[PDB]
Every structure is written in structure tokens, then in C-alpha cells.
């Protein structure tokens, strides 16, 4: 269920990834038409977003609050549609038909929509219903901000006063901070409300966390890229966060045998440098049926191996998860394959006073981007397989239903972990996924502004570590506590000739610091950076600063090293991303 809103959520993010930064006119209009068909066609999507959170929270919005929200949304739809049709005409029509009379038409349509948004927003944030209105608020907030940036692109063409364009910009800055902070605050409120002790508590908790990531958190991560003044070119970026699909189980009710909340939550992957699925070792066990005829084999445990980010080749192998094999081990290798789907079979044996169930078969769909070919690899228990009961596509739909899956998928497999049920009743497998936008090569685009997340480094040093992200950056961050080197990231230049770049850094610091940049161990850039926070402070939107390095440089190597100095006892520096600006 709810796959509809999940798909809409996934698609919007996927489309926006193509019109982020300063977009070209044709691309902007194309986006807008899909946008209107997806998010703004009727009241149906809005109603579905409200029901989505009500389902996750097991609470309902007061009818009066639900109705007013829907009323505001009908009005906002008209404003958006009227605006888009006019914008479309403007782009299409030559720089001749632009008379003062048509300029005023577009100016008032724009002013109306923008104003209606500021006025309506509080309706999606009524006291006591903040969490329940989260996906609705996130989608409305996104529209408002996306709409706003248009004033910086077409402002002068439309004949707006310098004062008007400026007022719009300040308004965009204030709202980007507010809307972001609002979403993170209530996201967390909801998350804590779902913490429990049972296995059933954890499934709910994790479903909320995954669904809120796809529909809210991924979206707010794009907001800063709507600043076409700071980002006067197209932006190449990616989402580095993990999402965990629902556990694969044969029965709807485990009658108390499900792994406890703590035994799952405390053992799932902790903030780590980015990596890729490399290998899986399947362990199988025999489950006897009370009458022999009803027996079956099942996936009991596993090993997982991942390869790090480009620049390092040493394979990381996981501890053993679950139970040792009673049957012959099965190994699947993924070197240079992208797992875009996983479909599973489960089976059960009913005993006089017990039920035993397990995952008997798993079919993995893989795509080879090098040899441009799809194929499948499967795990088979080999004894009484049963039927398919779990499909990843239901939880992680494709970005587009237009293209074939191997082209339009939204996520790929990163991790596999087996949990043991209480009292030796079986094994629960849990799968971790990563977003399709992640570029393995860490490629620096010669025409765009490239955002490089620090978690794409292959080596941390001087006691630098991966820490949980503040929920609005699309992934995790790097914490620096000592003076010295911090991270080494491998970079792939897209051009051969001596193209020059400017670097910008998105960070947070308790003190004034010095950042140093090196290529293949040779320093080339060193600069002074401001303090952004006080010791102890929690990280909100304003905690981060985006600052340039003075001097331009060429990519005469691949190994980029970031180093920090100027720290004192108790000082901390958080690094999110490094950006490259193609310059002449």
C-alpha cells in the first residue's frame, strides 16, 4: 500500500535532480509540466499524503483541519497552473512579442501564486497536527521555493523593479531556513514517538524513517540548490543516505518471537564512508516439518563484502550474521553489477504448537552499466521453495514508469544483514539500499558546478570520523576533532585539457580555522574560514557556511586531501561537501 505517494515522492526528487542550480529554459518548462501532472493535478495526491502519515502514526487529522488544508490546496493549484501556462508562453515566444502589457500579466500571476503560498503555509502546520501534515507541508514548501527562484531568472525580463527582485531573494533565504528546520524538527518528533521495545515497534519505526526520507528528507536536501545566484550554472549532485526496506518474513504475526527493537536498531550499519555491494555468502539450514513431507530449507545466515569508494581497492568483509550453514554455502558476486531489484519467496511449516518460517529463494536483478546489459542472479534453498511474498519494487519504486526498470530504477542494493529470532525459531533478513544518483567515479563536470560529499572519501585520518548527518544534507558528515589531515578523496576529471576551477566548502566550525587542499600530496590551496557555531550547539540550517577558496587551480592529479588547523581543545569541525566551479 501507499506505493502511489512513494512513487510520486521518488519521481519529483529524480526530476528535480535534473533542474537543480540555474536550469535552461526548455528544461525548466518540461519539468513544470510533469510537476503539474504529478503533484498538482487534483486533490487526490494531497489527500493521499495526509492519509500516508495517518497510517504511519496511527492517528487522524481533525476533519476541520483536513478540509481547510484541502481548500487552500485547490486555490494554490489554480495559481500554479495559471502561472506555468504563462511562463510556457513567455519562453516559447520571441523577444519581440514582449510588450509592457504581457510583462504585467506574468508579473501579477507570479505575485499572486507567491503571496498565496506564504499565506496558506500555516494551514499545513496547525498545532497538534504538525507531524501528520509533514509530507503535505514538505511538498507545498518545495513548490513555494521552486516558484520563488524564477524571480531571479526572469525578474528583469518581466520588468520587475530591482527592489522587487531583491525582496523576493531575501524572502527565499528566510524561508529556505524555516521550511528546512520545520521539517527536521517534526520529523524527529514523529521518529521518537515510534520507538518501542518489540519487533513490531521497530518495523513501524523503520517504515516511517524510510517513507519520510523518500517524501520529505530527500526533498529538503535540494532547497539550497534553488539559489540561482549562488548556483548560476547547472549542478551535478547526489544523495548518499541509506534506507532499509521492511524485513523479509513468512508470517504476518510472529507471536512474540520477532527480534527485539534493540537487537535490530543497535546492530544496523553505523555512519560509514560510502561503499558498494561486492559479494554475499548465503548460509542455508534444514527445517524439518512435523510430518517430513512439509520440510524446507531456508536462509539462516550470511556474510557480506563491500568495496570502498573509488581510490581504494581493499574489500571490506562483514562479521558473520545469523546461523552457520547446515547445507552447502552459496556465493554470489556483484563486481561491476548494480542490483536494482530483489524478489523473495518464503515458506512455513505448521507444527502442533509452533510455526516455522523462512526465506527460501531470492532473485536479484542486476544491470551492468559498462557492458550495458541486465541479468539475474538467484539464491535457492533447494528444498520446498514456496511462493514469492516480498518485492523491493513495492517499497522502492522506479523514478520513471516510462523506461525499462534497468534504466528507470531509483535505488541499488548496498547491504544484507541476517537477524536471529527469539528462541531459535528462525532468521529475519534485512536489506540496506542506496540512491541511484551516487556517481562511483567522483567525476568533476567541466560544464557544471559539482557537489562532492566528503563521505565519498576512501580514507579518513588524524582521528576524523563519519557522524550522523543533521537530516537536511542528503547523507552523513565528517567530524574533525584534531589539527591535521582529515580526508583523502579520489577525483575523476571529465576533460583532458588544463581546465581551471574554484573550490567552495560547506562546513560548520566552533572556531576560526584554516583549510588546506593537496593533490597527490602537494598543497595547492590554503585559506582562512569563519567560526559558525559555539561548542555544544546542535546543528540546524544556519550552523553551516558555504565559503570559497581565493585562488583557482587545475586538476593535475586525482588524490584530493583536505586538512584542518586552528583547532583548540574541545573544538569541532563538520565537513559536508566540497564543490568545484568551472572557471576561465
Angle between helices 3-16 and 25-38 (to 10 degrees): 170
DSSP letter assigned to residue 491: -
Cell readout for 267 is 546492530
Q: Are 27 and 18 in contact (CB under 8 A)?
A: yes
The sheet that has 427-435: what strands, in order across it? 242-244, 427-435, 411-420
Q: Report how far residue 546's alpha carbon sits from residue 506's, in angstroms, rounded to the nearest whole number.
A: 4
Q: Report how far residue 30's alpha carbon sits from residue 39's, in angstroms, rounded to the nearest whole number.
A: 14
Neighbour count for residue 84 (Cβ, 10 Å)? 19
Residues 87 and 136 in one domain: yes
Neighbour count for residue 224 (Cβ, 10 Å)? 22
> What H or E segment, with its residue span, contains residue 44?
helix 44-57
Give which of 538, 543, 557, 548 is closest to 509, Cα–Cα.
Answer: 543
Alpha-helical runs (H) found in 155-277:
162-193, 199-212, 218-220, 261-265
Task: Give the position of cell 565537513.
Answer: 575
The full DSSP string for 373-387 is EEEEEEEE-SS---E
Task: Give the count of domains, the chain.
Answer: 3
Q: Are 224 and 176 in contact (CB under 8 A)?
A: yes
Neighbour count for residue 195 (Cβ, 10 Å)? 12
Q: Report how far residue 364's alpha carbon sits from residue 338's, in angstroms, rounded to the nearest whole number.
A: 10
Give the CA-trace dihedral at 291, 292, 294, 298, to 10 degrees. 130
- Length of the chain equals 584
Angle between helices 3-16 and 134-154 (to 10 degrees): 20
Rg (C-alpha) for the chain, rounded Å, is 26
- Give the domain-ending residue among 437, 455, 484: 437
**No. of helices (H) and no. of strands (E), the chain:** 11, 27
Residues 421 and 482 in one domain: no
Cell readout for 424 is 531459535
Alpha-helical runs (H) found in 93-161:
100-120, 134-154
DSSP letter assigned to residue 225: G
Q: Find how far residue 544's CA is from the centre of its chain.
A: 19
Q: Report how far residue 223's alpha carbon sits from residue 234's, in angstroms, rounded to the nearest whole number.
A: 14
406 Cβ partners below 8 Å, 6+ apart? 340, 365, 367, 374
The sheet that has 387-391: what strands, in order across it? 373-380, 354-368, 338-351, 387-391
Cell readout for 185 is 524538527
The full DSSP string for 3-17 is HHHHHHHHHHHHHHT
> Cα-flanking dihedrals φ and ψ of residue 116, to 5°?
-60, -35
Q: Report how far residue 360's alpha carbon sits from residue 346's, in angstroms, rounded to the nearest whole number.
A: 5
> What H or E segment, with its residue span, contains residue 56?
helix 44-57
Q: Are 408 and 398 in contact (CB under 8 A)?
A: yes
How far is the first Cα of the chain from the last one, in angstroms, to the nearest whole number?
52
Q: What is the CATH number of the domain that holds 133?
A: 1.20.190.10
Residues 141 and 94 in one domain: yes
Q: Report how far residue 577's alpha carbon sits from residue 563's, in angstroms, rounded to the nearest whole number.
A: 14
Residues 271 and 218 in one domain: no
- Solved with: X-ray
Residues 578 and 546 in one domain: yes
Q: Are 579 and 449 in contact (CB under 8 A)?
A: yes
Residues 246 and 102 in one domain: no
Residues 399 and 384 in one domain: yes
Q: Are 456 and 583 in contact (CB under 8 A)?
A: no
Residues 502 and 517 in one domain: yes
Q: Are 364 and 339 in contact (CB under 8 A)?
A: yes
Cell readout for 468 is 550522523
Residues 224 and 321 in one domain: no
- Give the domain-ending residue among 408, 437, 466: 437
Burial 30-58 (b: 16+ CB within 10 A, else e): bbbeebeeebbeeeebbbebbbbbeebbe
Angle at 183 between CA 179 and CA 185, to 5 degrees: 115
Cell readout for 336 is 561491476
Q: Report how far residue 477's alpha carbon sits from residue 575's, in angstroms, rounded to the nearest whole number.
A: 6
Burial of 64: CB neighbours in 10 Å, binned 0-12, 13-18, 19+: exposed
Give which of 410, 413, 506, 501 is closest to 453, Cα–Cα.
Answer: 506
Residues 248 and 356 in one domain: yes
Q: Report how far residue 109's alpha carbon sits from residue 37's, in angstroms, rounded to the nearest whole number.
A: 20
Neighbour count for residue 530 (Cβ, 10 Å)? 11
Neighbour count for residue 312 (Cβ, 10 Å)? 16
Residues 52 and 198 in one domain: yes
Q: What is the CATH number of the domain that holds 285?
A: 2.100.10.10
Neighbour count for residue 60 (Cβ, 10 Å)? 13
Q: Are 476 and 468 in contact (CB under 8 A)?
A: yes
Residue 515: which domain range?
230-240+438-584
Amino acid at each position: 500500500t501507499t506505493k502511489d505517494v512513494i512513487q510520486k515522492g521518488i519521481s519529483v526528487v529524480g526530476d528535480l535532480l535534473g533542474v537543480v542550480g540555474f536550469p535552461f529554459g526548455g528544461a525548466l518548462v518540461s519539468f513544470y509540466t510533469n510537476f503539474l501532472n504529478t503533484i498538482w493535478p487534483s486533490e487526490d495526491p494531497w489527500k493521499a499524503f495526509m492519509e500516508q502519515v495517518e497510517a504511519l502514526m496511527d492517528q487522524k487529522i481533525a476533519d476541520y483541519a483536513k478540509n481547510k488544508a484541502l481548500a487552500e490546496l485547490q486555490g494554490l493549484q489554480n495559481n500554479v497552473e495559471d502561472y506555468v501556462s504563462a511562463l510556457s508562453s513567455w519562453q516559447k515566444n520571441p523577444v519581440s512579442s514582449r510588450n509592457p502589457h504581457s510583462q504585467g500579466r506574468i508579473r501579477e500571476l507570479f505575485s499572486q501564486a507567491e503571496s498565496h503560498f506564504r499565506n496558506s503555509m500555516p494551514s499545513f502546520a496547525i498545532s497538534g497536527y504538525e507531524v501528520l501534515f509533514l509530507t503535505t507541508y514538505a511538498q507545498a514548501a518545495n513548490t513555494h521555493l521552486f516558484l520563488l527562484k524564477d524571480a531571479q531568472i526572469y525578474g528583469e525580463e518581466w520588468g520587475y523593479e530591482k527592489e522587487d527582485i531583491a525582496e523576493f531573494y531575501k524572502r527565499q533565504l528566510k524561508l529556505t531556513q524555516e521550511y528546512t528546520d520545520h521539517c527536521v524538527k517534526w520529523y524527529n518528533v514523529g521518529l521518537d514517538k515510534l520507538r518501542g521495545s518489540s519487533y513490531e515497534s521497530w518495523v513501524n519505526f523503520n517504515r516511517y524513517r524510510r517513507e519520510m526520507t523518500l517524501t520529505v528528507l530527500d526533498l529538503i536536501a535540494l532547497f539550497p540548490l534553488y539559489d540561482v545566484r549562488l548556483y548560476p550554472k547547472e549542478v551535478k549532485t547526489e544523495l548518499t543516505r541509506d534506507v532499509l526496506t521492511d524485513p523479509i518474513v513468512g508470517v504476518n504475526n510472529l507471536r512474540g518471537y520477532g527480534t527485539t527493537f534493540s537487537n535490530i536498531e543497535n546492530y544496523i550499519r553505523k555512519p560509514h564512508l560510502f561503499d558498494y555491494l561486492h559479494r554475499i555468502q548465503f548460509h542455508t539450514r534444514f527445517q524439518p516439518g512435523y510430518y517430513g513431507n512439509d520440510s524446507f530449507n531456508y536462509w539462516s545466515g550470511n556474510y557480506v563484502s563491500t568495496r570502498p569508494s573509488i581510490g581504494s581497492n581493499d574489500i571490506i568483509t562483514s562479521p558473520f550474521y545469523g546461523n552457520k550453514s547446515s547445507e552447502p554455502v552459496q556465493n554470489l558476486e556483484f563486481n561491476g553489477e548494480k542490483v536494482y531489484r530483489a524478489v523473495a519467496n518464503t515458506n512455513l511449516a505448521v507444527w502442533p504448537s509452533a510455526v516455522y518460517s523462512g526465506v527460501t529463494k531470492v532473485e536479484f536483478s542486476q544491470y551492468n552499466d559498462q557492458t550495458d546489459e541486465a541479468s539475474t542472479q538467484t539464491y535457492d534453498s533447494k528444498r520446498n521453495v514456496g511462493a514469492v511474498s516480498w518485492d523491493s519494487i513495492d517499497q522502492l519504486p522506479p523514478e520513471t514508469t516510462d523506461e525499462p526498470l534497468e534504466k528507470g530504477y531509483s535505488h541499488q542494493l548496498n547491504y544484507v544483514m541476517c537477524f536471529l529470532m527469539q528462541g531459535s525459531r528462525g532468521t529475519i533478513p534485512v536489506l540496506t539500499w542506496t540512491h541511484k544518483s551516487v556517481d562511483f567515479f567522483n567525476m568533476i563536470d567541466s560544464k557544471k558546478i559539482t557537489q562532492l560529499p566528503l563521505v565519498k572519501a576512501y580514507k579518513l585520518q588524524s582521528g576524523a570520523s563519519v557522524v550522523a548527518g543533521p537530516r537536511f544534507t542528503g547523507g552523513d558528515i565528517i567530524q574533525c576533532t584534531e589539527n591535521g589531515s582529515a580526508a583523502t578523496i579520489y577525483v575523476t576529471p571529465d576533460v583532458s585539457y588544463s581546465q581551471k576551477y574554484r573550490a567552495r566548502i560547506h562546513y560548520a566550525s566552533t572556531s576560526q580555522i584554516t583549510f588546506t587542499l593537496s593533490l597527490d600530496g602537494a598543497p595547492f590551496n590554503q585559506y582562512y574560514f569563519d567560526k559558525t557555531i559555539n561548542k555544544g550547539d546542535t546543528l540546524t540550517y544556519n550552523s553551516f557556511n558555504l565559503a570559497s577558496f581565493s585562488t583557482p587551480f587545475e586538476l593535475s592529479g586525482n588524490n584530493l586531501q583536505i586538512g584542518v588547523t586552528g583547532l583548540s581543545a574541545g573544538d569541532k569541525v563538520y565537513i559536508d561537501k566540497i564543490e568545484f566551479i568551472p572557471v576561465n
